[PDB]
Write a protein that binds this DNA or RNA. Structure first.
Ligand SMILES: [Lu+3]
Ligand SMILES: [Lu+3]
Ligand SMILES: [Lu+3]
Ligand SMILES: [Lu+3]
Ligand code: NA
Ligand code: NA
Ligand code: NA
Ligand code: NA
Lengths: 244, 244
DNA sequence: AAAGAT
DNA sequence: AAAGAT
DNA sequence: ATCTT
DNA sequence: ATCTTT
């Protein structure tokens, strides 16, 4: 399928290619820094041509948002199935050592998920799947050799700001957690877990509907979540009692 | 001076080189997107070797943050005078057409300006200068960006995600405005003006004392602000009333 | 402009 | 974690 | 768009 | 870090 080929292609591109700098038209190379502002951006750009190649092979069109305030990174659809669009967002986080627990911020809980046309490229009800492409890297300290420019003959000498990048493709609902990933920007938190649990989809929600209902009714502050629900056990109790 | 050499060197590097891609150790190149998320990252990496070069010509150590949500991007200081540090932060915005007005977000008003050690690499009182390197790019209307990869001999084929770019170096206070640059993330708004106003330093504040005190005592919302001040004239009136 | 999206 | 930093 | 104690 | 929308 689209999905299985996508993951295989991402997995393979990650294994074979190590991003190492920004190149100019004139050939001068600027090294990367070792923070997530840099790498998230690099990992998205890395993923774009792979996503397009595989979508194209399976007859899907690809659209990126036209404005910067819109989910998702990529909308995939067949002309024949305009109400089965697939949303793909690329998310990145890091570890300080391999096999530590990780978490992602999975986007707002107050935009498209509570209002079908808010901050989203197409109406939310035209997507039948929402996939996360998750990148995890081990952070590496900045050496002095990062502070210089390089030439193309030097490509393999450029120090890389990461070790052991790993990638996964999983449904948003499946890796979603029950605690906010950010406060003042109201983001859904993923599970906090090892990489494999993301791959295998060892999440907390039982269905995509539960995921949606949890995040559609999650209050913004502890203050408010104290008398309603703060986590999944509490939400199940709130549901049991009649949503009160 | 350090300042004058750095601005010359930034003007020159910007004239000479046009970043166009992410390159891998193995020689494959991934194209850039044309939004500010991509470009602000790229412009910061682009400025990094130049900053280090010029700082080294003047005897200044450069440090970047270890923590990822600490200001500033670059900390300069001679080791003999550690209490005379210089903060350099890189900011990016876009225009549609050349020589419309632009504005930047210039960082938090509720962090280190109100608490000497919060979200800052060194305590705020050890810095004697706060410089903004501003990048303004003209957005290139190909929002059907390029969705293939290139080899080192096709560098010339790689679409660039800007129509032009200009750069300035100015003190933060000088270009600071009186209106928040963002809401939930509580940023200082720059002036809303043409690029030459930023280069020429045509601001609104009478002094860096005025700028600091203004942003130190600015309230977070309209309702709160409406009893205090919403702009620089009301701030001056607030000053006349006894800071009340 | 102010507030809340990415 | 929550809340508020970049 | 993600990070921080 | 910055955008777009009230
Ligand atoms: Lu994205
Ligand atoms: Lu920066
Ligand atoms: Lu930075
Ligand atoms: Lu910055
Ligand atoms: Na790799
Ligand atoms: Na949000
Ligand atoms: Na250039
Ligand atoms: Na802030």
């Amino acid at each position: 399928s689209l999905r299985s080929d996508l993951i295989n292609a991402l997995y393979d591109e990650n294994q074979k290619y190590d991003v190492c700098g920004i190149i100019s038209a004139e050939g001068k190379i600027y090294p990367l820094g070792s923070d997530t502002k840099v790498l998230s951006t690099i990992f998205e750009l890395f993923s774009r041509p792979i996503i397009n190649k595989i979508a194209e092979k399976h007859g899907y069109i690809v659209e990126e948002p036209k404005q910067q305030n819109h989910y998702p990174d990529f909308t995939l659809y067949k002309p024949s199935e305009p109400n089965k669009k697939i949303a793909i967002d690329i998310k990145t986080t890091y570890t300080n050592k391999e096999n530590e627990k990780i978490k992602f911020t999975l986007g707002g809980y107050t935009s498209f998920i509570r209002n079908n046309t808010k901050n989203i490229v197409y109406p939310f009800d035209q997507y039948i799947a929402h996939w996360i492409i998750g990148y995890v890297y081990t952070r590496v300290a900045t050496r002095k050799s990062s502070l210089k420019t390089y030439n193309i003959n030097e490509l393999n000498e450029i120090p890389k700001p990461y070790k052991g990048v790993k990638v996964f493709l999983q449904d948003k609902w499946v890796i979603a957690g029950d605690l906010a990933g950010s406060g003042n920007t109201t983001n859904i938190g993923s599970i906090h877990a090892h990489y494999k649990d993301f791959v295998e989809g060892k999440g907390i929600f039982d269905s995509e509907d539960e995921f949606l209902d949890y995040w559609r009714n999650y209050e913004r502050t502890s203050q408010l979540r104290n008398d309603k629900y703060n986590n999944i056990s509490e939400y199940r109790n709130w549901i049991y009692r009649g949503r009160k």
